Structures are given as structure tokens and as C-alpha cells.
């Protein structure tokens, strides 16, 4: 069950729909809309479409209603009748959509047509955001895609991360697991495999290829540092090179120059650099001078 | 009948955010202000004057 | 382990992507709009795809929406369908994107070329920066970009460091293990290695390499001085040579001139710098007027 | 390993690179854009050549 959750098949893909909507039945937590004039706007031609003209020159105030904008995910072999999962957010001066509803919105794709329509109840958590939500089931298939799945021979696994050895790896269990030539590799990030034609059977071959178990050789050495959130994280194949190392108000558990030692494992390098006794935010900095002088040997990603 | 005709090349960089672009922004503008029906036969030199008008030594 | 730590593989590189877009879904925290005008006219540009015509006269002063501008990195031998990681960062007057949701956004190269497309929820720690948020997986690629791999007998290890040492040991390692041709060296950072013809073969040739241990013969003596943070490094190269030292407010544990002998490995070289008694602050001044005289037997980098 | 640390090989060298560019994403600690015209200028640049006129 790993080869499932290190690549994704050619052609299954998920693509993204947008929609905009209004959302009613709000404790006076609505727009103010004389600062959104199209939630005025769509709520008269939500009207007009069911029949009731309100005259042009009419001041409207409204306290229940918010203009929203709603995201969805249109899954692979997505079928008409299907319902999905949206997100409903907040355009613009609202205060909150907690017990909201979500009148008829289509989710329109990027080529700008529709494949869903959306309408449900909100779940607002309620420290918790409350101009954003989320409906379950909220939006019933109305389109569906073409795809070429069943047709040749040859589907292509794309691996989440680009790596010849697991690629080679692979490539090497899907040999060793159904014939000789059952996969290839084609580059670091993709294995091409042959299939039989048909559609039944190229399922039952990605049924079988997807829960085999493949085991991952050691990737490269990489510390991954958010100043945002002030976090440092450091994969199993760190290693450290002895070098000196002074920072404001650190000092010898003495001298402010504190000596790293020679680290082979990641066990290792924790404990020499919690001998520092570095607050995260100094952390970062002697990292990346370390990475700079040449101790720390890694790649030093700054996310 | 009068006809505004207009040709050119435009930047699609000088193009607003309304759809429109001034026409000093136009490469090679070409712009036409023609009519027909006898408003535009009224202005018109006639032939003789025409001929008086180039050829006259004065 | 050590070969895919110390050089990269030519072709297989990492491209930049950014591009535009709109969050929505803040509590109250987003433009102000009357000082961002691009924020109101590009929600009015996705209210006019989207079929709403908001007249051109109208005051709209929303608090949940801000532009924002999404960057991202295309990895190699990208494929179409595969989701990457993307950051978000507000541009003007915002005050938070704490639940915020990115709408659909391209993500342009520096050809000015779609290559993926962006949606998701945002995720901010919440000390911590309010403006800047990540999405994993927030974007899905759309384009591929043409490659030379796989084509041609030969390909270069490019070193991160550059050194004639480390080359010609790469190179030697890569001799001893594949063949006596197989690697050569074209400069002090580029190592030349012949695969054979084809796809599969140079994959199974990199995985190959890739994994093999290079012992790393000892780099350049190199101490590092970060002013802004405050912060030294050195590596296990620098030596010392015996020299006096008199900076304000230090003196003998006596006199203000204060002996530093003369040190061989790293160890007696901090010993030697912390019985001197200085902040890090003062240590950067000591050690530019050492390299000046010539004591650091160390290359000073400021950084 | 004396050498390498006394001299350097010729054609053996490293040049400076400069370029302009803006930085987003700050906690209201930006430019003032009123006493920095060319802050807004080529963040209209930017726009222009995302597709935006403002």
C-alpha cells in the first residue's frame, strides 16, 4: 500500500470549479450592501428570474443576505448525480455566516462552463472563522469529462517527489511483481507501464500495481525552516562537521564560542545543537550561517 | 450615409481596463471621415474650377 | 548517500512561477479598497466572467477580500495533474489571511505562459506573520516543459561547491565503482559521465551514482560573520597564529593586551578566542583586525 | 591543504550580480509608497504585465 501513496496515474486528476452565490438566513450578520452593490445587484435578479420586478429606483437594506464566492473540486471520473464537498466564503463586509444557506450557485470550470450546482447549509465552527465555511455534499454533479483511461497500452505513475532511485525502485517491483517488461522508466519523476487493452483489465492491473509495497531509499539531506511560524525540521539524513559557533547572548554551559562537533546521524546532531541552548529563532540563524560556512550538511529550504 | 473607418495596430498593454484605448496609442492609424448624397456632392469643387485651381497662372 | 548531496543532474532543475490572485473568506481583515484599486477592479473583472456587470459608477468598500500574489516552484519533469505547494502573500494595506481561501489563479513562468493553476485554503501559524500563507497542494500543473534527457551518451554532475579536489574524487569514485571511463572532469565544478543510449538505461545509471559515498576531502578555511543577526561560524580549517589583542573594556583575567597563541585545529582555537573573554559582537571586530593583520589564517566572509 | 588556502586560480573567480525587485507579504512594515514613487510604479508594471491596468 505504498506505491498508491508515492505516485498518482496519468489522467486521474481532480480540477477545481468556482461559483458565486448568496447565502441567506443570517442573524443580522450579513452585507451592509450599500458598500456591495452586487449583492443587491444578483439578489433583484434572483428575483426577477422568479418573477418579482423590483422597481430600479428602490433603496434596499438588507441585513440577511451575503455575497459569496464558492470552491469546489471536481474529482476524477466524476459522474452527473454525484454530490461533492464546497467551501463558501465571504466577498466582502460581512460579519459572519453561521447559520447561513446556500441558494442555487453553478460551479463554473476554468473554460467557463458549468459541471455542478451548489446548494446546501453551512457549518461555520463558532478564535474560529466565521466569514468561511464548508457543506458537505453541497454540490451534485452536473457534467462530466471525456478522458482516455482504457484506451492504448502504456499508462504513466508520476511520482509526488523526482528521484532516480525511486523511480528505479519502482520500475524494479513492478518487474519483479508482474513479468519482465511490465514497467520502464522514463525519467525521475515518471515509470511508464504496459497494460493490457481494455478497460476491466487495466483496472484490475492498477488494483494490483497500487497496494504494493515498495520500500523508499533515503532522500536528500534537507532542513526546512518557517520564519512565519517560527519552525525548524530536519529529515533523518542531516549530518553535521565540527566548527565553532558564537550568537548574542549564548554562551559555554563560559566563552560565547561553543564548538559543534562531527555528527553522522540525526540523533547526534540534535544533541549538539541543543548543547547550543538555541531558542528556534536563534536556531534559524546559526543555521544558516552553518549552511553558509559549510558545517551544516544539507540543503537549507526556506518555506 | 457617412462612414468612420479605422485601422491599426494596438499594444495590448495600452488597452484599459474597460476595453479601450486612445486612438494617439494606434501605431499605424488610419482614420476615414467620408459621406455620399448630395451633401457631399455640394462639397465637391467642380471640374472647370478644379482645373483653374491647378492649372491657372495665377 | 553522498553523491546526490554534493551535485545536482544537468536538466534536472527547478523553474519559478507566479502569479496573481484573489482571497477571500477574511473576518474582517482584508483591503481597504480605497487605497488598493486593483483589489475592487479585479473582483470586478471575476464578477464579469462570471456574469455579474457591476456599474462602473459605485462605491464598494469591501473587508474580505485582498490581492494577493502566489508564487510557486514547477519542479522537474513535471507532469500535468500533479499538485504543488504555493505561497501567498498579501500586497497592499491587508491585515491578515488568517482563514482565508485563494481563488482560481494562474501561475504564469517568466515567459509569461500558464503552467499551473492555484486554489485552496490558506494555512498562517497565528509573533508569527498574519500576511503570508502557504497551500500544499494549492496548485495543479497544467503545462510540461520539453527535455534533452534521455538523449545523447553523456551527462553532468554539476558540483554545489566548487573544488578540484571533490571533482577529481567524484570523478574517481565513479571510475572505481562503473568502469574505467566512465567520468571525467571538465572543470572545478562539472563532472562529465558517459550513460548509454536511451531512457530506462540513464535512469538506472543515475540511480546508480546517485546513492554512492564520496569521502569529502577537507574545503577551505572560512569563517563566516552574520552582522545582522549577530552570529560567527568557523569550520574545522581555521587555524590561528599567535598575535597580541586590546579591545575596549577587555583585558587579562591585568593588561589591556592579551596574548592569542598560536592554534593548529578548531579546538585550540576557540579555547584560545573564549579565554580572550569576548561578546560575539566584540569577536567580529577581533577577528577583522586579525585578518587584517594576518593571525586568521581563514578566508572572512561577511554575510 | 596549505596551497588552496594561500592562492587562488586564475580564471578561477566569482562576479556581483544586482537586480531590482519587490517584497510582499509584510505585517504593515512596508514602504510608505508616497515619499517611494517607483514602489507603485513597478508594482503597476507588474500588474500591466499580469494582465491588470490599472
Redesign the interface.
Given at each position: 500500500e505504498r506505491i498508491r501513496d508515492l505516485t498518482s496515474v496519468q489522467g486521474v486528476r481532480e480540477n477545481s470549479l468556482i461559483g458565486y452565490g448568496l447565502v441567506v438566513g443570517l442573524d443580522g450578520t450579513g452585507d451592509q450592501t450599500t458598500q456591495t452593490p452586487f449583492t443587491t445587484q444578483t439578489l433583484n435578479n434572483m428575483l426577477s428570474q422568479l418573477g418579482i420586478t423590483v422597481p430600479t429606483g428602490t433603496n434596499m437594506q438588507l441585513k440577511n443576505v451575503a455575497a459569496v464566492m464558492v470552491t469546489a473540486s471536481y474529482p476524477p471520473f466524476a459522474r452527473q448525480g454525484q454530490t461533492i464537498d464546497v467551501v463558501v466564503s465571504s466577498m466582502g463586509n460581512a460579519k459572519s455566516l453561521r447559520g447561513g444557506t446556500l441558494l442555487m450557485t453553478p460551479l463554473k470550470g476554468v473554460d467557463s462552463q458549468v459541471y455542478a450546482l451548489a446548494q446546501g447549509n453551512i457549518l461555520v465552527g463558532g478564535v474560529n472563522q466565521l466569514n468561511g465555511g464548508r457543506i458537505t455534499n453541497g454540490a451534485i454533479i452536473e457534467r462530466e469529462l471525456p478522458t482516455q483511461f482504457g484506451a492504448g497500452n502504456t499508462i504513466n505513475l508520476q511520482l509526488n517527489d523526482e528521484d532516480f532511485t525511486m523511480a528505479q525502485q519502482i520500475t524494479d517491483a513492478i518487474n519483479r511483481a508482474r513479468g519482465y517488461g511490465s514497467a520502464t522508466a522514463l525519467d525521475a519523476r515518471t515509470v511508464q507501464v504496459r497494460v493490457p487493452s481494455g478497460n476491466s483489465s487495466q483496472v484490475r492491473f492498477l488494483a494490483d500495481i497500487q497496494n504494493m509495497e515498495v520500500n523508499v531509499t533515503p532522500q536528500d539531506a534537507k532542513v526546512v525552516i518557517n520564519s512565519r511560524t517560527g519552525s525548524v525540521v530536519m529529515n533523518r539524513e542531516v549530518t553535521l562537521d565540527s566548527c565553532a559557533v558564537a550568537q548574542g547572548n549564548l554562551s559555554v554551559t563560559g566563552g560565547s564560542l561553543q564548538s559543534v562537533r562531527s555528527s553522522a546521524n540525526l540523533n547526534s546532531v540534535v544533541r549538539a545543537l541543543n548543547a547550543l541552548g538555541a531558542t528556534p529563532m536563534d536556531l534559524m540563524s546559526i543555521l544558516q550561517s552553518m549552511q553558509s560556512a559549510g558545517c551544516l550538511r544539507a540543503k537549507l529550504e526556506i518555506i | 450615409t457617412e462612414f468612420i473607418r479605422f485601422s491599426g495596430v494596438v499594444n495590448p498593454?495600452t488597452?484599459?481596463?474597460?476595453n479601450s484605448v486612445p486612438s494617439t496609442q494606434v501605431a499605424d492609424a488610419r482614420i476615414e471621415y467620408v459621406g455620399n448624397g448630395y451633401i457631399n456632392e455640394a462639397q465637391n469643387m467642380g471640374w472647370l474650377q478644379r482645373f483653374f485651381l491647378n492649372l491657372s497662372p495665377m
Amino acid at each position: 500500500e505504498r506505491i498508491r501513496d508515492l505516485t498518482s496515474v496519468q489522467g486521474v486528476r481532480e480540477n477545481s470549479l468556482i461559483g458565486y452565490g448568496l447565502v441567506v438566513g443570517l442573524d443580522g450578520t450579513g452585507d451592509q450592501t450599500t458598500q456591495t452593490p452586487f449583492t443587491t445587484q444578483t439578489l433583484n435578479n434572483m428575483l426577477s428570474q422568479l418573477g418579482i420586478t423590483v422597481p430600479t429606483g428602490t433603496n434596499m437594506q438588507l441585513k440577511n443576505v451575503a455575497a459569496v464566492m464558492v470552491t469546489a473540486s471536481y474529482p476524477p471520473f466524476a459522474r452527473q448525480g454525484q454530490t461533492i464537498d464546497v467551501v463558501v466564503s465571504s466577498m466582502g463586509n460581512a460579519k459572519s455566516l453561521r447559520g447561513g444557506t446556500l441558494l442555487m450557485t453553478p460551479l463554473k470550470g476554468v473554460d467557463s462552463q458549468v459541471y455542478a450546482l451548489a446548494q446546501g447549509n453551512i457549518l461555520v465552527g463558532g478564535v474560529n472563522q466565521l466569514n468561511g465555511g464548508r457543506i458537505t455534499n453541497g454540490a451534485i454533479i452536473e457534467r462530466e469529462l471525456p478522458t482516455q483511461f482504457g484506451a492504448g497500452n502504456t499508462i504513466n505513475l508520476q511520482l509526488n517527489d523526482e528521484d532516480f532511485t525511486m523511480a528505479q525502485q519502482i520500475t524494479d517491483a513492478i518487474n519483479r511483481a508482474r513479468g519482465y517488461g511490465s514497467a520502464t522508466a522514463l525519467d525521475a519523476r515518471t515509470v511508464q507501464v504496459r497494460v493490457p487493452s481494455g478497460n476491466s483489465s487495466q483496472v484490475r492491473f492498477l488494483a494490483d500495481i497500487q497496494n504494493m509495497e515498495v520500500n523508499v531509499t533515503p532522500q536528500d539531506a534537507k532542513v526546512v525552516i518557517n520564519s512565519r511560524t517560527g519552525s525548524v525540521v530536519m529529515n533523518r539524513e542531516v549530518t553535521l562537521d565540527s566548527c565553532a559557533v558564537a550568537q548574542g547572548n549564548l554562551s559555554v554551559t563560559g566563552g560565547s564560542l561553543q564548538s559543534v562537533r562531527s555528527s553522522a546521524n540525526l540523533n547526534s546532531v540534535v544533541r549538539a545543537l541543543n548543547a547550543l541552548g538555541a531558542t528556534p529563532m536563534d536556531l534559524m540563524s546559526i543555521l544558516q550561517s552553518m549552511q553558509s560556512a559549510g558545517c551544516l550538511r544539507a540543503k537549507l529550504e526556506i518555506i | 450615409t457617412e462612414f468612420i473607418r479605422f485601422s491599426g495596430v494596438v499594444n495590448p498593454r495600452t488597452i484599459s481596463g474597460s476595453n479601450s484605448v486612445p486612438s494617439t496609442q494606434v501605431a499605424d492609424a488610419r482614420i476615414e471621415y467620408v459621406g455620399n448624397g448630395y451633401i457631399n456632392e455640394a462639397q465637391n469643387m467642380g471640374w472647370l474650377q478644379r482645373f483653374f485651381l491647378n492649372l491657372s497662372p495665377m
